[PDB]
Amino acid sequence: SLRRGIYHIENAGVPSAIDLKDGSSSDGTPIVGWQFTPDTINWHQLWLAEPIPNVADTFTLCNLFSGTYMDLYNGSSEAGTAVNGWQGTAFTTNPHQLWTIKKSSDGTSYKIQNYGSKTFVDLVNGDSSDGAKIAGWTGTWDEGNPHQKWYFNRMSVSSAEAQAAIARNPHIHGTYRGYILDGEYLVLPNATFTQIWKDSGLPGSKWREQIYDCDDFAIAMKAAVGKWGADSWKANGFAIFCGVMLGVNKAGDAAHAYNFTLTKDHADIVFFEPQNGGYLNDIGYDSYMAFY
Amino acid sequence: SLRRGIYHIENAGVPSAIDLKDGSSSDGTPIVGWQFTPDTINWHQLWLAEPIPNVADTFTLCNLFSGTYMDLYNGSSEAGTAVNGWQGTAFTTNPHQLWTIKKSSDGTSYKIQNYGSKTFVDLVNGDSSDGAKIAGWTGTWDEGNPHQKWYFNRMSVSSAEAQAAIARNPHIHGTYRGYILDGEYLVLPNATFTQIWKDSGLPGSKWREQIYDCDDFAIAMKAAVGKWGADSWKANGFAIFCGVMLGVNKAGDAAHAYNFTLTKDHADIVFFEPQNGGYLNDIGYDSYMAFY
Ligand SMILES: C[C@@H]1O[C@@H](O[C@@H]2[C@@H](O[C@H]3O[C@H](CO)[C@H](O)[C@H](O)[C@H]3O)[C@@H](O)[C@@H](CO)O[C@@H]2O)[C@@H](O)[C@H](O)[C@@H]1O
Ligand SMILES: C[C@@H]1O[C@@H](O[C@@H]2[C@@H](O[C@H]3O[C@H](CO)[C@H](O)[C@H](O)[C@H]3O)[C@@H](O)[C@@H](CO)O[C@@H]2O)[C@@H](O)[C@H](O)[C@@H]1O
Ligand SMILES: C[C@@H]1O[C@@H](O[C@@H]2[C@@H](O[C@H]3O[C@H](CO)[C@H](O)[C@H](O)[C@H]3O)[C@@H](O)[C@@H](CO)O[C@@H]2O)[C@@H](O)[C@H](O)[C@@H]1O
Ligand SMILES: C[C@@H]1O[C@@H](O[C@@H]2[C@@H](O[C@H]3O[C@H](CO)[C@H](O)[C@H](O)[C@H]3O)[C@@H](O)[C@@H](CO)O[C@@H]2O)[C@@H](O)[C@H](O)[C@@H]1O
Ligand SMILES: C[C@@H]1O[C@@H](O[C@@H]2[C@@H](O[C@H]3O[C@H](CO)[C@H](O)[C@H](O)[C@H]3O)[C@@H](O)[C@@H](CO)O[C@H]2O)[C@@H](O)[C@H](O)[C@@H]1O
Ligand SMILES: C[C@@H]1O[C@@H](O[C@@H]2[C@@H](O[C@H]3O[C@H](CO)[C@H](O)[C@H](O)[C@H]3O)[C@@H](O)[C@@H](CO)O[C@H]2O)[C@@H](O)[C@H](O)[C@@H]1O
Ligand SMILES: [Ca+2]
Ligand SMILES: [Ca+2]
Ligand SMILES: [Ca+2]
Ligand SMILES: [Ca+2]
Ligand SMILES: [Cl-]
Ligand SMILES: [Cl-]
Ligand code: NA
Ligand code: NA
C-alpha cells in the first residue's frame, strides 16, 4: 500500500508530472501534465497523500502549494471528465476527492482510481506537452495502458525513516539521544536548503563568543527552515526536514553545534555547517544530541 | 570573591548606577552616576566582570552595550582622575583597565580599586544627580565612606545556576535531560522577554498541523532572543537566557513544546507559551527535554 507522504507523480509513458496549473487555489483549476526538473522543488507538482481510515488503499491528494485537493468534476464516470484542484479537507467523505491508489500490472507504477466513479486518472492521448489534459477515464486495474500509469516518487520521510538514516551514520556518539518533533518531512534538495540559508542572513553573521556562537547559528538555521515551510506551502500535515545536532570531537574536549539534512535517496544524513554553508559527510564531531 | 557575571552597580549612599554616558563606544566617554529603573534593562548600566587568571579578586569591567572597558585615565593616582570607557580586551594587562573588587567593611557592598593606581572608584561628593562625575580617589579598604561603596546587583546566571533553578521545579519529568549551550546568561525581565516576542512576529503566527505547530513556535522564540542578543549588545562572552522545553502531560498521551525564563531572584523557572505570550508557573506538562 502506498504510504502517507508527499509525492511527485510522474506518468509512466512520458516524463510529465501531475501539475496543478499555476499553483492556483481557485476551485476548478485544471490539473495537467507538465515537464519537471529533477533534484528541485517542483512547486506545483507535489501531492500530500492522506490515507482514509478504514478504507483500504484510498486517499485524498492535497496539492502542497495550493492546499486544494484533486477533484473529479461532479464525480462523473464519463471518459474525459475534468480532474481539477478544489477546496476540501484531508478526511473528506466527498467521493469526488477520494482516490484508490494501487500498483499497476508493472508492479512499479500505480493506477489512480476515483472512489466514486471507478474511473482512472488518465494523461489524455499520452500527450507530453506542457498543459496536456488529465481526465478521468474508463480503464481496468490490470491493463498496460501507460496513459493511466503513474510513478509515485516519494519526496518525504517519516520520522522513523529519518531516525533510521541517523542511526546508520558512523559519526554518532555513544551517548546520543534524538528528539523527534514532527511525523512526516519534506526532504529538500541541497540547492533549496542552501537558498534558505542564504536568504536567512546567516551568511553574513559573525561568530561571537557565547552571544552568537555555534549554537545560535544552528538554531537560527532551523528556525529559518521552519519559517520557510509555513510561508511557502498552504497544505498542512507535514514539516520540512532540518535538524540540529550537538556533537563532541574524538579527543573529547570540544563540542560543536551544526545542522543536518538527508541524501537524495533518503537513506543517509549529511551535515551542514551554518557558519559557512558547507555540506560534509564528516564534520569532525560525533553527535550526542539531535532535534528535528 | 565576586563571581564572573553581568552586574548593575549601584552606589551605596544614593540610588545612582555606574553609567557609561550615552552608551558611547568612543574612547574617553565619561562614566557617571545616573538614576535607574528597577526590573528593566538599564541599557547603559550593565557591566561584564571577567576574572583575570591568577590575579586574585581582579577583573576587567566591560560595558555590555558599548563593548568598551572601564578605564582610569592614564592610570593616575591623583584624586579626581577621570574614569571613562575605553577600547580594550577581556584579559588585558593594561592596569588602567584592571580593577580589584572586594567587599567593603559593611560586608554587602564592594569597593572598586584600580590595580595600577590603588585608588578607588568614587561617586564624587555623593552627588545623586544624573551625570555626576565618577573618579578615581584616595581611600582605604576598611573605611565607611559611601562615596566609594557599590552594590554589585547580579543580572546574569551561570549555567549551573540555571540548571539548579530547573531542578527545583515541580514540573520536571522523570526522564528529563537538559542540554546546556552557553556558560553565562543575562536574565531578562518579563517586560523585555515579551517585547522580543512581540517584535518576532510570533503573535501573528497561526498554529498549523506539523508545518507551524508548537515546536516551531518555541524554536522561533529562542532564535528571536538569540538574534536580539547579538543585535543589541556589543560585548561578547555571555548569552541571553531563553530555553526550549518539550513536555508530556500527566496522562502521558500528549506532548507540547514551549519556552522558559527565570524569576527575578534567579531561583526558579517560569514557563512561557509562545503561541500567546502567557507566563505560567504550571503549563500542564512535565518537561522531558530542555535546551538553553
Ligand atoms: C454532491 C455535492 O457534493 C459537494 O459539492 C461538490 C464539491 O465539493 C467540494 O467543494 C464544495 C464547494 O464547491 C464544498 O467546499 C465541499 O465541502 C467540497 O467537498 C466539488 O467536489 C464539486 C466539483 O467536483 O462537486 C460538488 O459541487 C457538496 O458541497 C454539495 O452540497 C453536494 O453534496
Ligand atoms: C492507443 C490506444 O491505447 C488504449 O486506448 C487509450 C484509452 O484507454 C482507455 O480507454 C479505452 C476507451 O476509450 C478502454 O477503456 C481502455 O481499456 C482504457 O485504458 C485512453 O487512455 C485514451 C485517453 O488517453 O487514450 C487511448 O485511446 C487502447 O485501448 C486502444 O486500443 C489503443 O491501443
Ligand atoms: C602606557 C600606555 O598604555 C596603553 O595606552 C593606554 C590606553 O590603552 C588602551 O587604549 C589604547 C588606544 O588608545 C590601546 O587600544 C590599548 O591596547 C588599550 O589598552 C588607555 O588605557 C589610555 C587611557 O587611560 O591610556 C593609555 O593611552 C598602550 O597602548 C600605550 O602604548 C602605552 O603603553
Ligand atoms: C564628607 C567627607 O567624607 C569623606 O571625604 C570624602 C572623600 O574621601 C576620600 O578622600 C579623602 C581625601 O579627599 C580621604 O582619602 C578619605 O579616606 C577617602 O575616602 C572623597 O570621597 C570625596 C569625593 O567624593 O568626598 C569626600 O571629601 C571624609 O574623609 C571627610 O572627612 C568627610 O567626612
Ligand atoms: C514557481 C514557478 O515554477 C516554475 O514554473 C512553473 C512550472 O514549473 C514546471 O515547469 C517548468 C517549465 O515550465 C520546469 O520544468 C519546472 O522544473 C517545473 O516545476 C509549472 O508548474 C507551471 C504550470 O503549473 O507553472 C509555472 O509557474 C518556474 O519555471 C518559475 O520560474 C517559477 O519558479
Ligand atoms: C537607551 C535609552 O535608555 C534610557 O535613557 C538612557 C539613560 O537611562 C537611564 O536613565 C533613565 C533616565 O534618564 C532611566 O532611569 C533609565 O531606567 C536608566 O537606564 C541613561 O543611561 C543615559 C546616560 O547614559 O542615556 C539615556 O539614553 C531611556 O530613557 C531612553 O528612552 C532609551 O531607551
Ligand atoms: Ca510537532
Ligand atoms: Ca550561544
Ligand atoms: Ca555556546
Ligand atoms: Ca513542526
Ligand atoms: Cl494490456
Ligand atoms: Cl570609616
Ligand atoms: Na560565515
Ligand atoms: Na497566538
Author numbering:
A (entry chain A), B (entry chain A): 2 to 293
Sentences from the paper on this structure:
The Marasmius oreades agglutinin (MOA) is a 293 amino acid, homodimeric, histo-blood-group-B specific chimerolectin extracted from the fruiting bodies of the common fairy ring mushroom. Each MOA protomer is composed of two domains, accounting for the lectin’s sugar-binding and proteolytic functions, respectively. The proteolytic activity is associated to the C- terminal α+β dimerization domain, which closely resembles the consensus papain fold (r.m.s.d.: 2.2 Å), including the Cys/His catalytic dyad (Cys215, His257). In contrast to other known PLCPs, the proteolytic domain of MOA carries a binuclear calcium binding site.
The different orientations of Z-VAD-fmk were defined as ‘direct’ or ‘inverted’, depending on whether the VAD peptide was aligned with (‘direct’) or against (‘inverted’) the standard backbone orientation of a PLCP substrate. Consistent with known Z-VAD-fmk-bound complexes, the inhibitor molecule binds to the active site of MOA forming a thioether with the catalytic cysteine (Cys215). In the ‘direct’ orientation, the inhibitor molecule extends along the MOA dimerization interface, interacting with both protomers. The carbonyl group of the aspartate residue lies within hydrogen bonding distance of the backbone NH group of the catalytic cysteine (3.0 Å) and the indole NH of Trp208 (3.0 Å). The aspartate side chain of the inhibitor points away from the catalytic cleft, and forms a hydrogen bond with the backbone carbonyl oxygen of Ala256 (3.2 Å), which also engages in a hydrogen bonding interaction with the Asp backbone NH group (3.3 Å). The adjacent carbonyl group in the Ala-Asp peptide group interacts strongly with the solvent-exposed Ca2+ ion (2.3 Å), replacing a water molecule present in the calcium-bound structure of MOA. The side chain of the alanine moiety of the VAD peptidyl group snugly fits into a hydrophobic cavity lined by residues Leu247, Ala258 and Leu182# (‘#’ denotes a residue provided by the symmetry-related protomer). The carbonyl group of the Val-Ala peptide group contacts the backbone NH of Ala256 through a water-mediated interaction (Z-VAD-fmk-Ala3(O)/HOH: 2.4 Å). Based on the structural alignment with papain, Z-VAD-fmk occupies either the unprimed (S1-S3, ‘direct’ conformation) or the primed (S1’-S3’, ‘inverted’ conformation) subsites on the catalytic cleft of MOA. The S2 specificity pocket of MOA is defined by the P2 alanine side chain of Z-VAD-fmk.
